[PDB]
mmCIF file of C-alpha atoms in Angstrom:
data_model
loop_
_atom_site.group_PDB
_atom_site.id
_atom_site.type_symbol
_atom_site.label_atom_id
_atom_site.label_comp_id
_atom_site.label_asym_id
_atom_site.label_seq_id
_atom_site.Cartn_x
_atom_site.Cartn_y
_atom_site.Cartn_z
ATOM 1 C CA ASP A 1 -25.406 -17.576 -1.236
ATOM 2 C CA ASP A 2 -24.943 -17.068 -5.056
ATOM 3 C CA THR A 3 -24.383 -13.199 -5.985
ATOM 4 C CA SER A 4 -26.207 -13.983 -9.175
ATOM 5 C CA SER A 5 -28.744 -16.000 -7.279
ATOM 6 C CA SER A 6 -29.475 -12.755 -5.077
ATOM 7 C CA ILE A 7 -29.650 -10.442 -8.361
ATOM 8 C CA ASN A 8 -31.897 -12.989 -9.979
ATOM 9 C CA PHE A 9 -33.946 -12.514 -7.185
ATOM 10 C CA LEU A 10 -34.151 -8.697 -6.979
ATOM 11 C CA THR A 11 -34.823 -8.084 -10.765
ATOM 12 C CA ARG A 12 -38.155 -9.968 -10.076
ATOM 13 C CA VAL A 13 -39.134 -6.725 -8.507
ATOM 14 C CA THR A 14 -40.782 -4.094 -11.337
ATOM 15 C CA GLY A 15 -38.292 -1.376 -11.933
ATOM 16 C CA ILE A 16 -35.524 -3.053 -10.608
ATOM 17 C CA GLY A 17 -32.788 -4.172 -13.744
ATOM 18 C CA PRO A 18 -29.641 -5.591 -13.628
ATOM 19 C CA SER A 19 -27.838 -2.619 -13.129
ATOM 20 C CA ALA A 20 -29.779 -1.515 -10.227
ATOM 21 C CA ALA A 21 -29.705 -4.901 -8.748
ATOM 22 C CA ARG A 22 -26.320 -5.049 -8.514
ATOM 23 C CA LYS A 23 -26.115 -1.758 -6.803
ATOM 24 C CA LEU A 24 -28.131 -3.373 -4.082
ATOM 25 C CA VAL A 25 -26.275 -6.274 -3.667
ATOM 26 C CA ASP A 26 -23.352 -4.536 -3.200
ATOM 27 C CA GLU A 27 -25.056 -2.248 -0.476
ATOM 28 C CA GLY A 28 -26.057 -5.755 1.048
ATOM 29 C CA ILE A 29 -29.627 -5.819 -0.009
ATOM 30 C CA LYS A 30 -29.993 -9.190 -1.586
ATOM 31 C CA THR A 31 -33.170 -10.342 -0.336
ATOM 32 C CA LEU A 32 -37.115 -8.791 -0.168
ATOM 33 C CA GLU A 33 -37.078 -8.539 3.532
ATOM 34 C CA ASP A 34 -33.881 -6.486 2.967
ATOM 35 C CA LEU A 35 -35.271 -4.323 0.271
ATOM 36 C CA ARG A 36 -38.393 -3.601 2.365
ATOM 37 C CA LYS A 37 -36.018 -2.302 4.805
ATOM 38 C CA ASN A 38 -34.044 0.229 2.371
ATOM 39 C CA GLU A 39 -36.956 1.923 0.731
ATOM 40 C CA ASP A 40 -34.791 5.072 0.627
ATOM 41 C CA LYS A 41 -32.105 3.145 -1.568
ATOM 42 C CA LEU A 42 -35.123 2.601 -4.511
ATOM 43 C CA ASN A 43 -36.730 5.157 -6.912
ATOM 44 C CA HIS A 44 -40.038 5.365 -6.964
ATOM 45 C CA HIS A 45 -40.827 2.812 -9.833
ATOM 46 C CA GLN A 46 -39.153 0.449 -7.656
ATOM 47 C CA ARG A 47 -40.724 1.319 -4.397
ATOM 48 C CA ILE A 48 -44.023 0.987 -5.608
ATOM 49 C CA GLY A 49 -43.090 -2.109 -7.670
ATOM 50 C CA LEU A 50 -41.785 -3.593 -4.188
ATOM 51 C CA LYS A 51 -44.867 -2.696 -2.339
ATOM 52 C CA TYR A 52 -47.303 -4.822 -4.673
ATOM 53 C CA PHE A 53 -44.260 -7.729 -4.931
ATOM 54 C CA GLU A 54 -46.800 -10.022 -3.811
ATOM 55 C CA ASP A 55 -49.846 -9.221 -5.976
ATOM 56 C CA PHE A 56 -47.636 -8.565 -9.272
ATOM 57 C CA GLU A 57 -46.673 -12.185 -9.259
ATOM 58 C CA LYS A 58 -50.244 -13.639 -9.752
ATOM 59 C CA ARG A 59 -52.002 -14.359 -12.764
ATOM 60 C CA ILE A 60 -55.028 -12.534 -13.683
ATOM 61 C CA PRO A 61 -58.324 -14.604 -14.628
ATOM 62 C CA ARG A 62 -59.982 -13.843 -17.997
ATOM 63 C CA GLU A 63 -63.070 -12.646 -15.966
ATOM 64 C CA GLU A 64 -61.145 -10.072 -14.253
ATOM 65 C CA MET A 65 -59.616 -9.028 -17.556
ATOM 66 C CA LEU A 66 -62.948 -8.582 -19.142
ATOM 67 C CA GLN A 67 -64.293 -6.407 -16.167
ATOM 68 C CA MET A 68 -60.899 -4.854 -16.498
ATOM 69 C CA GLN A 69 -61.395 -3.755 -20.125
ATOM 70 C CA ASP A 70 -65.069 -2.587 -19.270
ATOM 71 C CA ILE A 71 -64.157 -0.049 -17.050
ATOM 72 C CA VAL A 72 -60.806 1.305 -19.360
ATOM 73 C CA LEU A 73 -62.879 1.075 -22.749
ATOM 74 C CA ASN A 74 -65.952 3.148 -20.819
ATOM 75 C CA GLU A 75 -63.981 6.014 -19.549
ATOM 76 C CA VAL A 76 -62.105 6.574 -22.885
ATOM 77 C CA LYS A 77 -65.367 6.197 -24.908
ATOM 78 C CA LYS A 78 -66.916 8.916 -22.626
ATOM 79 C CA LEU A 79 -63.767 10.772 -22.753
ATOM 80 C CA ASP A 80 -63.656 11.057 -26.066
ATOM 81 C CA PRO A 81 -65.373 8.699 -28.694
ATOM 82 C CA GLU A 82 -63.179 9.152 -31.366
ATOM 83 C CA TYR A 83 -60.101 7.475 -28.646
ATOM 84 C CA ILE A 84 -59.326 3.690 -29.744
ATOM 85 C CA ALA A 85 -57.991 1.383 -26.997
ATOM 86 C CA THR A 86 -57.217 -2.205 -27.626
ATOM 87 C CA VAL A 87 -56.353 -4.246 -24.728
ATOM 88 C CA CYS A 88 -53.634 -6.745 -26.200
ATOM 89 C CA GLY A 89 -51.195 -9.641 -24.972
ATOM 90 C CA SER A 90 -52.208 -13.516 -24.419
ATOM 91 C CA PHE A 91 -55.716 -11.603 -23.200
ATOM 92 C CA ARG A 92 -56.170 -10.692 -26.896
ATOM 93 C CA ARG A 93 -55.472 -14.343 -28.405
ATOM 94 C CA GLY A 94 -57.875 -15.644 -25.776
ATOM 95 C CA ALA A 95 -55.942 -16.867 -23.193
ATOM 96 C CA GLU A 96 -57.737 -18.238 -19.366
ATOM 97 C CA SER A 97 -55.179 -15.952 -17.776
ATOM 98 C CA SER A 98 -53.124 -13.257 -18.284
ATOM 99 C CA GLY A 99 -50.205 -11.446 -16.634
ATOM 100 C CA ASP A 100 -50.850 -8.174 -17.114
ATOM 101 C CA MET A 101 -53.265 -5.681 -18.994
ATOM 102 C CA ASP A 102 -51.599 -4.187 -21.632
ATOM 103 C CA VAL A 103 -53.668 -1.317 -22.965
ATOM 104 C CA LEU A 104 -52.954 0.449 -26.528
ATOM 105 C CA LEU A 105 -54.562 3.599 -26.925
ATOM 106 C CA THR A 106 -54.579 5.859 -30.170
ATOM 107 C CA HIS A 107 -56.563 8.796 -31.576
ATOM 108 C CA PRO A 108 -57.216 10.227 -35.259
ATOM 109 C CA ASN A 109 -55.778 13.355 -34.373
ATOM 110 C CA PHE A 110 -52.374 11.689 -33.127
ATOM 111 C CA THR A 111 -50.172 11.182 -36.374
ATOM 112 C CA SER A 112 -46.991 10.183 -36.528
ATOM 113 C CA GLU A 113 -46.612 13.538 -39.078
ATOM 114 C CA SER A 114 -48.497 15.486 -35.877
ATOM 115 C CA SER A 115 -47.461 16.683 -32.725
ATOM 116 C CA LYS A 116 -46.667 14.749 -30.261
ATOM 117 C CA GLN A 117 -49.653 14.782 -27.946
ATOM 118 C CA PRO A 118 -48.803 13.382 -24.247
ATOM 119 C CA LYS A 119 -51.955 15.073 -23.109
ATOM 120 C CA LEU A 120 -54.290 12.708 -25.113
ATOM 121 C CA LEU A 121 -52.540 9.904 -22.864
ATOM 122 C CA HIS A 122 -52.665 11.760 -19.614
ATOM 123 C CA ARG A 123 -56.413 12.682 -20.212
ATOM 124 C CA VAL A 124 -57.266 9.287 -19.959
ATOM 125 C CA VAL A 125 -54.946 8.825 -17.473
ATOM 126 C CA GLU A 126 -55.817 10.960 -15.052
ATOM 127 C CA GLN A 127 -59.792 9.964 -15.463
ATOM 128 C CA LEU A 128 -58.754 6.549 -14.392
ATOM 129 C CA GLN A 129 -57.237 8.143 -11.494
ATOM 130 C CA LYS A 130 -60.837 9.822 -10.593
ATOM 131 C CA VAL A 131 -62.876 6.584 -10.980
ATOM 132 C CA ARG A 132 -60.254 5.088 -8.516
ATOM 133 C CA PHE A 133 -59.122 2.435 -10.980
ATOM 134 C CA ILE A 134 -55.697 3.158 -11.275
ATOM 135 C CA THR A 135 -54.258 2.818 -7.684
ATOM 136 C CA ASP A 136 -50.847 3.853 -8.233
ATOM 137 C CA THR A 137 -48.116 5.084 -10.722
ATOM 138 C CA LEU A 138 -44.775 3.418 -11.474
ATOM 139 C CA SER A 139 -43.924 5.686 -14.452
ATOM 140 C CA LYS A 140 -45.920 8.339 -16.106
ATOM 141 C CA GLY A 141 -44.585 8.656 -19.559
ATOM 142 C CA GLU A 142 -45.116 10.991 -22.423
ATOM 143 C CA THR A 143 -46.153 7.851 -25.146
ATOM 144 C CA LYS A 144 -46.312 4.832 -22.419
ATOM 145 C CA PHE A 145 -48.048 4.971 -18.785
ATOM 146 C CA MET A 146 -46.556 2.528 -16.555
ATOM 147 C CA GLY A 147 -48.793 1.789 -13.522
ATOM 148 C CA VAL A 148 -51.057 -0.138 -10.960
ATOM 149 C CA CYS A 149 -54.873 -0.513 -10.635
ATOM 150 C CA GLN A 150 -57.125 -2.889 -9.015
ATOM 151 C CA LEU A 151 -60.864 -3.697 -9.620
ATOM 152 C CA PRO A 152 -63.693 -2.293 -7.536
ATOM 153 C CA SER A 153 -64.796 -4.265 -4.146
ATOM 154 C CA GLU A 154 -67.732 -2.685 -2.891
ATOM 155 C CA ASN A 155 -67.478 -3.001 0.882
ATOM 156 C CA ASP A 156 -67.646 -5.944 2.855
ATOM 157 C CA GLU A 157 -65.986 -7.181 -0.134
ATOM 158 C CA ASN A 158 -62.571 -9.087 0.084
ATOM 159 C CA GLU A 159 -60.681 -6.667 -2.129
ATOM 160 C CA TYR A 160 -59.463 -7.808 -5.675
ATOM 161 C CA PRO A 161 -55.654 -8.004 -6.034
ATOM 162 C CA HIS A 162 -53.384 -5.325 -7.840
ATOM 163 C CA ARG A 163 -52.756 -5.808 -11.227
ATOM 164 C CA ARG A 164 -49.789 -4.353 -13.495
ATOM 165 C CA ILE A 165 -51.183 -2.019 -16.270
ATOM 166 C CA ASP A 166 -49.591 -0.562 -19.206
ATOM 167 C CA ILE A 167 -50.887 1.616 -21.305
ATOM 168 C CA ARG A 168 -49.092 3.057 -25.081
ATOM 169 C CA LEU A 169 -49.902 5.847 -26.762
ATOM 170 C CA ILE A 170 -49.795 5.348 -30.446
ATOM 171 C CA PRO A 171 -49.788 7.168 -33.548
ATOM 172 C CA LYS A 172 -53.109 6.246 -35.629
ATOM 173 C CA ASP A 173 -50.946 5.685 -38.747
ATOM 174 C CA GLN A 174 -49.058 2.969 -36.615
ATOM 175 C CA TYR A 175 -51.977 1.606 -34.651
ATOM 176 C CA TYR A 176 -52.286 -1.598 -36.109
ATOM 177 C CA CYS A 177 -48.701 -2.410 -36.389
ATOM 178 C CA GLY A 178 -48.669 -1.951 -32.646
ATOM 179 C CA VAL A 179 -51.639 -4.163 -31.969
ATOM 180 C CA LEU A 180 -50.145 -6.696 -33.975
ATOM 181 C CA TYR A 181 -47.021 -6.576 -32.449
ATOM 182 C CA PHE A 182 -48.198 -6.460 -29.120
ATOM 183 C CA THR A 183 -50.942 -9.490 -29.449
ATOM 184 C CA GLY A 184 -48.578 -11.332 -31.498
ATOM 185 C CA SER A 185 -46.978 -14.198 -29.939
ATOM 186 C CA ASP A 186 -43.550 -14.124 -29.859
ATOM 187 C CA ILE A 187 -43.162 -16.871 -32.290
ATOM 188 C CA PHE A 188 -46.178 -16.079 -34.634
ATOM 189 C CA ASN A 189 -44.696 -12.141 -34.981
ATOM 190 C CA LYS A 190 -41.444 -13.993 -35.738
ATOM 191 C CA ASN A 191 -43.147 -16.231 -37.897
ATOM 192 C CA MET A 192 -45.079 -13.599 -39.946
ATOM 193 C CA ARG A 193 -42.001 -11.198 -39.956
ATOM 194 C CA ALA A 194 -40.186 -14.049 -42.245
ATOM 195 C CA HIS A 195 -42.796 -14.416 -44.426
ATOM 196 C CA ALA A 196 -42.909 -10.690 -44.670
ATOM 197 C CA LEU A 197 -39.434 -10.893 -45.786
ATOM 198 C CA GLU A 198 -40.362 -13.676 -48.036
ATOM 199 C CA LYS A 199 -42.729 -11.831 -50.249
ATOM 200 C CA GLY A 200 -40.646 -9.013 -50.028
ATOM 201 C CA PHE A 201 -41.840 -6.753 -47.046
ATOM 202 C CA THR A 202 -40.558 -5.954 -43.768
ATOM 203 C CA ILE A 203 -42.841 -5.570 -40.819
ATOM 204 C CA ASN A 204 -41.847 -4.164 -37.456
ATOM 205 C CA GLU A 205 -43.883 -2.578 -34.442
ATOM 206 C CA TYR A 206 -44.459 0.472 -36.097
ATOM 207 C CA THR A 207 -44.713 -0.169 -40.027
ATOM 208 C CA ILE A 208 -44.880 -2.410 -42.897
ATOM 209 C CA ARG A 209 -42.616 -1.139 -45.965
ATOM 210 C CA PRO A 210 -41.936 -2.919 -49.090
ATOM 211 C CA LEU A 211 -38.429 -3.658 -49.971
ATOM 212 C CA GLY A 212 -36.861 -2.492 -53.489
ATOM 213 C CA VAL A 213 -34.967 -4.269 -55.977
ATOM 214 C CA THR A 214 -31.855 -3.181 -54.084
ATOM 215 C CA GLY A 215 -33.407 -4.215 -50.827
ATOM 216 C CA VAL A 216 -34.062 -0.515 -49.502
ATOM 217 C CA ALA A 217 -37.022 -0.227 -47.466
ATOM 218 C CA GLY A 218 -39.288 2.492 -48.841
ATOM 219 C CA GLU A 219 -42.602 3.891 -47.436
ATOM 220 C CA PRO A 220 -44.563 2.997 -44.524
ATOM 221 C CA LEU A 221 -47.304 1.694 -46.504
ATOM 222 C CA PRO A 222 -51.366 2.608 -44.804
ATOM 223 C CA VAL A 223 -52.765 0.198 -42.488
ATOM 224 C CA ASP A 224 -56.083 0.633 -40.987
ATOM 225 C CA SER A 225 -56.581 -2.650 -39.705
ATOM 226 C CA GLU A 226 -54.401 -5.926 -39.048
ATOM 227 C CA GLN A 227 -56.393 -7.245 -42.300
ATOM 228 C CA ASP A 228 -54.544 -4.602 -44.411
ATOM 229 C CA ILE A 229 -51.189 -6.015 -42.992
ATOM 230 C CA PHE A 230 -51.737 -9.644 -43.779
ATOM 231 C CA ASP A 231 -53.306 -8.421 -47.360
ATOM 232 C CA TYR A 232 -50.132 -6.686 -48.315
ATOM 233 C CA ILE A 233 -48.224 -10.084 -47.570
ATOM 234 C CA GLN A 234 -50.825 -12.011 -48.876
ATOM 235 C CA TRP A 235 -51.464 -14.231 -46.104
ATOM 236 C CA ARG A 236 -54.375 -15.611 -44.703
ATOM 237 C CA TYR A 237 -55.814 -13.715 -41.365
ATOM 238 C CA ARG A 238 -54.967 -15.742 -38.375
ATOM 239 C CA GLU A 239 -57.311 -14.409 -35.712
ATOM 240 C CA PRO A 240 -55.705 -13.637 -32.338
ATOM 241 C CA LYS A 241 -56.925 -16.946 -30.937
ATOM 242 C CA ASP A 242 -55.069 -18.876 -33.595
ATOM 243 C CA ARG A 243 -51.906 -16.892 -33.152
ATOM 244 C CA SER A 244 -50.410 -19.889 -30.901
ATOM 245 C CA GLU A 245 -47.194 -21.635 -31.259
ATOM 246 C CA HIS A 246 -48.823 -23.819 -33.586
ATOM 247 C CA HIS A 247 -48.184 -22.505 -37.045
ATOM 248 C CA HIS A 248 -49.747 -23.428 -40.391
ATOM 249 C CA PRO B 1 -38.011 22.272 -65.315
ATOM 250 C CA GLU B 2 -39.184 18.699 -66.811
ATOM 251 C CA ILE B 3 -35.697 16.819 -67.847
ATOM 252 C CA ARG B 4 -35.615 15.502 -71.134
ATOM 253 C CA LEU B 5 -35.562 11.878 -71.534
ATOM 254 C CA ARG B 6 -33.137 10.424 -74.315
ATOM 255 C CA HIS B 7 -34.145 7.304 -75.414
ATOM 256 C CA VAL B 8 -34.527 3.539 -73.571
ATOM 257 C CA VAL B 9 -31.548 1.771 -72.638
ATOM 258 C CA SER B 10 -33.340 -1.199 -71.334
ATOM 259 C CA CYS B 11 -36.727 -3.129 -70.473
ATOM 260 C CA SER B 12 -37.278 -6.099 -68.622
ATOM 261 C CA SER B 13 -41.187 -6.157 -70.201
ATOM 262 C CA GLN B 14 -43.045 -4.205 -72.806
ATOM 263 C CA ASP B 15 -46.391 -4.856 -74.657
ATOM 264 C CA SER B 16 -45.966 -4.559 -78.459
ATOM 265 C CA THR B 17 -48.229 -1.487 -78.477
ATOM 266 C CA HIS B 18 -47.811 -0.248 -74.870
ATOM 267 C CA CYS B 19 -43.788 -0.252 -75.079
ATOM 268 C CA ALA B 20 -41.302 1.278 -72.974
ATOM 269 C CA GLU B 21 -40.675 3.920 -75.359
ATOM 270 C CA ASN B 22 -44.031 5.573 -74.694
ATOM 271 C CA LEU B 23 -42.631 6.895 -71.408
ATOM 272 C CA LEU B 24 -40.751 9.071 -73.577
ATOM 273 C CA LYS B 25 -43.820 10.183 -75.535
ATOM 274 C CA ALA B 26 -46.197 13.085 -73.841
ATOM 275 C CA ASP B 27 -49.706 11.739 -73.278
ATOM 276 C CA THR B 28 -51.648 8.936 -72.053
ATOM 277 C CA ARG B 29 -49.676 5.976 -74.740
ATOM 278 C CA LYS B 30 -48.545 3.838 -71.833
ATOM 279 C CA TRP B 31 -45.750 1.754 -70.674
ATOM 280 C CA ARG B 32 -47.290 -2.213 -69.894
ATOM 281 C CA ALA B 33 -46.088 -5.547 -68.948
ATOM 282 C CA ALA B 34 -46.050 -7.987 -71.835
ATOM 283 C CA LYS B 35 -47.918 -10.297 -69.801
ATOM 284 C CA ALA B 36 -50.064 -9.408 -66.993
ATOM 285 C CA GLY B 37 -49.224 -12.381 -64.593
ATOM 286 C CA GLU B 38 -46.033 -10.733 -64.105
ATOM 287 C CA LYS B 39 -45.208 -9.601 -60.479
ATOM 288 C CA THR B 40 -42.624 -6.719 -61.288
ATOM 289 C CA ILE B 41 -41.312 -4.938 -64.397
ATOM 290 C CA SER B 42 -38.378 -2.740 -65.262
ATOM 291 C CA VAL B 43 -36.774 0.019 -67.402
ATOM 292 C CA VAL B 44 -33.819 2.049 -67.920
ATOM 293 C CA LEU B 45 -33.871 5.420 -69.649
ATOM 294 C CA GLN B 46 -30.493 7.231 -70.350
ATOM 295 C CA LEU B 47 -30.995 11.278 -70.126
ATOM 296 C CA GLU B 48 -30.405 13.855 -72.529
ATOM 297 C CA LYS B 49 -27.364 14.950 -70.534
ATOM 298 C CA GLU B 50 -25.859 14.498 -66.527
ATOM 299 C CA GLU B 51 -28.275 16.848 -64.555
ATOM 300 C CA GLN B 52 -29.667 16.690 -60.666
ATOM 301 C CA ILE B 53 -32.913 15.338 -60.096
ATOM 302 C CA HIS B 54 -34.924 17.530 -57.777
ATOM 303 C CA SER B 55 -38.545 16.536 -58.396
ATOM 304 C CA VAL B 56 -40.197 13.576 -59.523
ATOM 305 C CA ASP B 57 -43.770 12.951 -60.657
ATOM 306 C CA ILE B 58 -45.140 9.282 -61.262
ATOM 307 C CA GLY B 59 -48.169 8.564 -63.637
ATOM 308 C CA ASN B 60 -49.557 5.121 -62.486
ATOM 309 C CA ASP B 61 -51.108 2.564 -64.968
ATOM 310 C CA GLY B 62 -51.999 -0.475 -62.800
ATOM 311 C CA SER B 63 -49.208 -1.076 -60.543
ATOM 312 C CA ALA B 64 -49.223 -1.773 -57.145
ATOM 313 C CA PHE B 65 -45.795 -0.228 -56.264
ATOM 314 C CA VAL B 66 -43.077 2.054 -58.140
ATOM 315 C CA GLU B 67 -39.434 2.760 -57.426
ATOM 316 C CA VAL B 68 -37.054 4.910 -59.146
ATOM 317 C CA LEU B 69 -33.153 4.318 -58.907
ATOM 318 C CA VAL B 70 -30.285 6.293 -60.798
ATOM 319 C CA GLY B 71 -27.150 5.696 -62.437
ATOM 320 C CA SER B 72 -24.740 6.961 -65.169
ATOM 321 C CA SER B 73 -23.329 5.790 -68.097
ATOM 322 C CA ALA B 74 -19.981 5.815 -67.354
ATOM 323 C CA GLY B 75 -18.688 2.774 -64.754
ATOM 324 C CA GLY B 76 -20.881 0.668 -66.665
ATOM 325 C CA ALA B 77 -24.541 -0.123 -65.604
ATOM 326 C CA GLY B 78 -25.492 -3.563 -63.487
ATOM 327 C CA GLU B 79 -27.667 -4.541 -60.956
ATOM 328 C CA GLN B 80 -26.724 -2.904 -57.603
ATOM 329 C CA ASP B 81 -24.553 -0.401 -60.080
ATOM 330 C CA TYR B 82 -27.748 1.780 -59.037
ATOM 331 C CA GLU B 83 -28.495 4.224 -56.225
ATOM 332 C CA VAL B 84 -31.840 4.519 -54.829
ATOM 333 C CA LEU B 85 -33.508 8.060 -55.429
ATOM 334 C CA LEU B 86 -36.944 7.215 -54.586
ATOM 335 C CA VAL B 87 -37.762 4.383 -52.488
ATOM 336 C CA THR B 88 -40.570 2.042 -53.168
ATOM 337 C CA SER B 89 -43.965 3.776 -52.892
ATOM 338 C CA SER B 90 -47.623 2.871 -52.896
ATOM 339 C CA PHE B 91 -49.939 3.444 -55.728
ATOM 340 C CA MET B 92 -52.447 1.034 -55.609
ATOM 341 C CA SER B 93 -53.809 -1.074 -52.302
ATOM 342 C CA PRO B 94 -54.023 -5.031 -52.430
ATOM 343 C CA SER B 95 -57.954 -4.736 -52.636
ATOM 344 C CA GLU B 96 -58.322 -2.082 -55.642
ATOM 345 C CA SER B 97 -55.151 -3.960 -57.218
ATOM 346 C CA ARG B 98 -57.168 -7.514 -57.286
ATOM 347 C CA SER B 99 -60.237 -5.129 -58.653
ATOM 348 C CA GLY B 100 -58.503 -3.046 -61.318
ATOM 349 C CA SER B 101 -59.871 -0.116 -59.593
ATOM 350 C CA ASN B 102 -57.796 3.780 -59.182
ATOM 351 C CA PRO B 103 -55.247 2.309 -61.880
ATOM 352 C CA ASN B 104 -54.570 5.899 -62.793
ATOM 353 C CA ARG B 105 -53.151 7.302 -59.700
ATOM 354 C CA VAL B 106 -50.526 10.062 -59.848
ATOM 355 C CA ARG B 107 -48.098 11.264 -57.502
ATOM 356 C CA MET B 108 -45.375 14.189 -57.255
ATOM 357 C CA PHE B 109 -42.358 13.598 -55.372
ATOM 358 C CA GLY B 110 -40.732 16.200 -53.802
ATOM 359 C CA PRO B 111 -37.169 16.793 -53.169
ATOM 360 C CA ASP B 112 -37.780 16.020 -49.127
ATOM 361 C CA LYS B 113 -39.321 12.655 -50.210
ATOM 362 C CA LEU B 114 -36.303 11.501 -52.020
ATOM 363 C CA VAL B 115 -33.688 9.641 -50.196
ATOM 364 C CA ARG B 116 -31.337 13.125 -49.934
ATOM 365 C CA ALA B 117 -27.629 11.049 -49.885
ATOM 366 C CA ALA B 118 -28.357 10.221 -54.206
ATOM 367 C CA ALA B 119 -30.266 13.133 -54.835
ATOM 368 C CA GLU B 120 -27.560 15.529 -53.921
ATOM 369 C CA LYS B 121 -25.613 13.786 -56.781
ATOM 370 C CA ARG B 122 -26.305 13.778 -60.507
ATOM 371 C CA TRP B 123 -26.922 11.481 -63.031
ATOM 372 C CA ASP B 124 -27.577 10.332 -66.269
ATOM 373 C CA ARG B 125 -29.866 7.001 -66.110
ATOM 374 C CA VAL B 126 -32.817 6.163 -64.654
ATOM 375 C CA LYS B 127 -33.981 2.734 -63.360
ATOM 376 C CA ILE B 128 -37.904 2.381 -62.925
ATOM 377 C CA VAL B 129 -39.346 -0.774 -61.412
ATOM 378 C CA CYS B 130 -42.999 -1.458 -61.089
ATOM 379 C CA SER B 131 -44.635 -4.205 -59.239
ATOM 380 C CA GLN B 132 -48.093 -5.544 -59.016
ATOM 381 C CA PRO B 133 -48.218 -8.992 -57.108
ATOM 382 C CA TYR B 134 -52.047 -8.840 -56.303
ATOM 383 C CA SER B 135 -53.316 -9.330 -59.830
ATOM 384 C CA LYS B 136 -52.422 -11.900 -62.441
ATOM 385 C CA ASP B 137 -54.982 -10.637 -64.665
ATOM 386 C CA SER B 138 -54.974 -6.786 -64.959
ATOM 387 C CA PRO B 139 -52.585 -5.166 -67.115
ATOM 388 C CA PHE B 140 -50.042 -2.932 -64.987
ATOM 389 C CA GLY B 141 -47.270 -0.254 -66.049
ATOM 390 C CA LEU B 142 -47.033 3.250 -66.012
ATOM 391 C CA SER B 143 -49.177 6.158 -67.943
ATOM 392 C CA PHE B 144 -46.185 8.506 -67.667
ATOM 393 C CA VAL B 145 -43.206 9.802 -65.734
ATOM 394 C CA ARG B 146 -41.399 13.030 -65.149
ATOM 395 C CA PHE B 147 -38.123 14.323 -63.738
ATOM 396 C CA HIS B 148 -37.509 17.893 -62.634
ATOM 397 C CA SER B 149 -33.922 19.687 -61.906
ATOM 398 C CA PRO B 150 -33.675 22.690 -59.679
ATOM 399 C CA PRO B 151 -35.060 26.199 -60.605
#
């Protein structure tokens, strides 16, 4: 069938962008059946993304999300209590199901002025490996971990599906801007940023900055909570639940 | 070295007794909005001579944000004839502003904290914009301001 049709398919595998997707086509790899016969032609990320292809296309019930949240938040608390981990995405907005678990991590000792500290994220990552929560890795980054995890099923018990997990390590002074952005709703973040500009401020993934009289973004403003951000723009605080595609 | 301020070129809003000229007199003797309820106020000070700005001190009086631009007498002086030396900086949170707490914060702005592009150049005018939108009660402006040239 159509080449783009073949391509559009391959992209659905985690780790297979359009570039890598076209190279698989030329080499004759159009289908999943083909991909599973050609793992050597994929990098690890992709090799594993294909391994769990079926499990990653399913939705995640909120009950499972919760169980997952607990495992994560516990180990992280027991490791170092100064840690701060907030599961975000649709889950934070009270969606009955998620597509994947998006964790954001931070620590007082790690600011944007301080030294890069991958071991703050890896310490959390390797522990989740011990307790057998993270089954596989897709990409062990310095600031973001991408990988696979599974809820425990003690035996004779039909195993849970495997789920996509993201863990972003973020500077403390940029944390609640990250949570805002990664909880958001595409439309809510768009609407809030627009009102930011109305009130003369500029919000982004990292920071909220005032806009000078000539329109030059100023210094990042102190943010110790999502409320702070709302306050700067003097906008009523919307609970995550009300960050729908219905605006008021 | 303290730069010496000559006089006041302009001022968008100033109180009768807390006028813009007090930004010349040493002490605190303030510059304040004619009307609180205003959201921003502005001044233009002329310098005694074209010199290079190395460092800026800002003495706050109720303002939520402060920005400092620079310019020259030559080439006229309008809105965006001015360059941003110090970008809008925070002196007072929304909560504090809403409750007139800690109006008197003071800050130093060393070379690194200036927009290097503009600070390399030298000027003889300085635009100063004070903002305070989180209250329509409290007086707001500046206690003092000190510009410095390299040693």
